[PDB]
Each structure stands twice: as C-alpha cells, then as structure tokens.
Design a protein around this ligand. Structure first.
Ligand SMILES: N[C@@H](Cc1cc(I)c(Oc2cc(I)c(O)c(I)c2)c(I)c1)C(=O)O
Ligand SMILES: N[C@@H](Cc1cc(I)c(Oc2cc(I)c(O)c(I)c2)c(I)c1)C(=O)O
Lengths: 114, 115, 115, 114
C-alpha cells in the first residue's frame, strides 16, 4: 500500500475512525480527478487506499472530511475539511504516510516517506 | 482587521516572512473567487488583508505558498502549499486569526475566533 | 520583555486564559530555582514575566499548569502539566517567545527567538 | 507492550531513530525513579520499553533526548529535551502510545490510550 493515512483525535486520545477520505490526482489539464475514496477504520487508517498501479508520478490531493467527524462527537468544528497536497514519485517510487492530528480548532499534518 | 494570519518557521525559530498568501471565497457554483492577497511581513503577519465590508458570510480558503518559501531557503519541501478552509461569519460578525506553523515535511494550523 | 508566552486552546478556538505559569532556572547542582510566576491573561499572554537583568545565561524551564486549566472546563486532561526546557542567552542576549497549543490529549510548543 | 513511543522528524519526513528515551515513575516521596531506558529504532519506536509487571498505577515521565538527535543531523536544536508527564492506569490497566513530532524549534506530543 504506497499511500497510507493515520488520523488521530487530540481531544479524546484515540485514533479517529469513520473519517471520510478522498484521493485526487491533478490532470495534465490541471483539474482534480478522483482516484479513490475510503473511510478510516478503528486504528485511524485505510487499507488499499490506492493500488501501486494507479499511484503514478504526479500531484495528489488527499481530502479528509474532518467536519463530519467532529459533528459525530457533538463538538463544533472550525474547518470545512483538511486537504493535503503534494507531489509523489517525482524522484522514484516510494511509500507515503499522511499523518493527521485533529482538534476542533486545529489540525497538524506530517508526511513520512520511505 | 477581521482576518489575520500568523506564520512561523519551526526549523529556524523565526516568523516566516515573505510567504505569499491569497484569500478566496466560494461562490454558489463551488468556484473560488479571489478577494485578498498579501505577503507576510517580518513578524509573519499581513495587515489589512480584507475589510469587514468584504468579509461576508461564506466559505473561505486561505492559501499559503509554502513551497516557494522553503525553496528560497534551499530546503526540499514536501507540500505544494497549505490551504485552510472554513466557514466564517455564519453566527454574526467575528474576528479570525489563522495561525500556521511550517516545517519542510509538516505543518500545523490553528484558528482563534473572537467577538 | 525578553521572555514571552502565548497559550491557545485548540478545543474552543480561544486563547487559554488563567493558565498558571512558573519559570525556573537550573543551578549548577541541577536543582531548579524559581525566578518568575504569572497567569495568562485573556489573550493567553503574560506581561513582565522576567527582566533582562534576571534573565541571564543558563537552562530554563517554563512550567504550564495545563491540568488545572482543563479540569476547570470539565474536560479530562491526559498530562499532568507541560514543561518546556531550553538554554537561553548563550550566544548573547535574545528575546524568546514560548508558544503552546493545548488539547486534552495533545500539546504542541514552538519557540521564536529574535535579536 | 503497555507503553509505546512513536517519534517522527518533521524536517526530513522520516521516523526519528537513535533518540534516547528514559522512563521514570514518581515516588511515594515524589521523586523520579528511573524504570527503563532505550533508544528509538528505524521506525521511531522502542520495543519492550517496560514490562506489564513494572508498569503500575502512578505518575510517569517519559524523557526524550531531542537535543542529541538534532546535533546528529547538524541542525541547531532549541530545546534541551522533551519530557511528557502523565498519570497512567488511574482508572484501569490500558495501553499508552506517546507520539512525538520533532522540528529544531518545535515539538508536538499526543497520547493514544487503548
Ligand atoms: N502504527 C502504524 C500507524 C502509525 C503511523 C504514524 I506516521 C504514527 O505517528 C504519528 C505521530 C504523531 I505526533 C501524530 O500526530 C500522528 I496522527 C501519527 C502513529 I502513533 C501510528 C505505523 O507505525 O505505520
Ligand atoms: N502577537 C500576535 C500574533 C500571534 C498570534 C498567535 I494565534 C500566536 O500564537 C501561535 C502559537 C503557536 I503553538 C503557533 O504555532 C503559531 I504559527 C502561533 C503568536 I506566537 C503570535 C497576536 O497575539 O495576535
């Protein structure tokens, strides 16, 4: 799995489950094309988010619906969502983890590339 | 000033100056209309980004060109940029600060909302 | 003011007011000598924590009582407190801001150093 | 393993290896007693950091020597180290992960409790 996510809830101290995620890749044109969609599991992760074959060199957007997550907890969210945008495999085929830490009025993201 | 930014550099321990910022408001179609531009100053801030008159209820995107910032320092950035998207002024007029902390492979953002 | 703090609440989107802060300096023995105290104000800051005269070269601990803060809000905190420890003024006199972002099960701290 | 760590390098996008870690528990007296020491591996983790038997209810300090880590990379560190202090098992025996994200002038820590 060359593209992984790990989402954590900074308020409750647990992984953030049921967070809807979409993966897009930017066109030759420059438009975003949706490649996959999934929902985080109990460990805040998504298995098989993208195949090695579909995950080619280019610019990617990983979109997290953080707003619905906080509404499901009865907390007021500030952000509409969190998008993370990066170039992948520009200098070779690697594995990427997009880590995302959530609070109602803050989020942090870090990329681990191997 | 109802919309403020504060940008910090976690590698150097200084405010991130000369970061290009753009502010957009989503129209009903879903497209983004640019309403502001600026570049952070030596304290990582931008004065007079938008007026109260322009800053009406809606969905906003604050776009930070973090890639150009790190490249100017000779560092290899991971992200293309950082966008921060939120609904504003939907429960009355408020003031907002979008704070952004930058490292080449990480960023954090926090919102402070006051009345 | 050579030592400033800025404390924010990531749950509520407001500065974290009424947070008790203490500043210590390590002596040669390794024990900690208290030099300052304060409580954050409505913007999450403390004025006049220490003077330039007192703030000499050494190792400092800035101690934030984050547990009392979250308990006052009815929230269950994980940490007993947050300490931030660093060497100051070892390459000349500088000014420091210790920024601290709080959630019940997480915190982030960033230092801004100027001359 | 009831007490785990996960340390990441926000500058390089890799787990932070070779970070020295000490685990202390506070005395009845109130003094810190060292229970264990280890060093993060290539995935930023430490196996067998503490046994289930030694990890009893009380107040813990997990100490990370972040200063030597940044010096090993040739970057100037601001902090002397990062200490994370918390009560464990006050309401039952659980597993704890202390996650720690490092930059030369910033760090973030989050606790995941299961
Ligand atoms: N166990 C799996 C999944 C996993 C990946 C990461 I990357 C991680 O590390 C962090 C650190 C911080 I600080 C965060 O705020 C967040 I979100 C994730 C953690 I815990 C777990 C693995 O090792 O691949
Ligand atoms: N002096 C001005 C500007 C200012 C706002 C904030 I909001 C702030 O706080 C943080 C805290 C953390 I942690 C960050 O990573 C970042 I970026 C900013 C700081 I320092 C300064 C004011 O009070 O409005």
């Amino acid at each position: 799995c060359p593209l992984m996510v790990k989402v954590l809830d900074a308020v409750r101290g647990v992984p953030a489950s049921n967070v809807a995620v979409k993966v897009f890749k930017q066109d030759e044109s420059g438009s975003w094309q949706q490649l996959s969609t999934g929902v985080t599991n109990e460990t805040g992760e998504i298995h098989n988010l993208i195949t090695e074959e579909a995950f080619t060199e280019g610019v990617y957007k990983v979109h997290f619906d953080t707003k619905t997550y906080w509404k499901s907890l009865g907390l007021t969210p500030f952000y509409e969502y969190a998008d993370v945008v990066f170039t992948a495999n520009d200098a070779g085929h690697r594995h990427y983890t997009i880590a995302l830490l959530l609070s109602p009025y803050s989020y942090s993201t870090t990329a681990v590339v191997s």
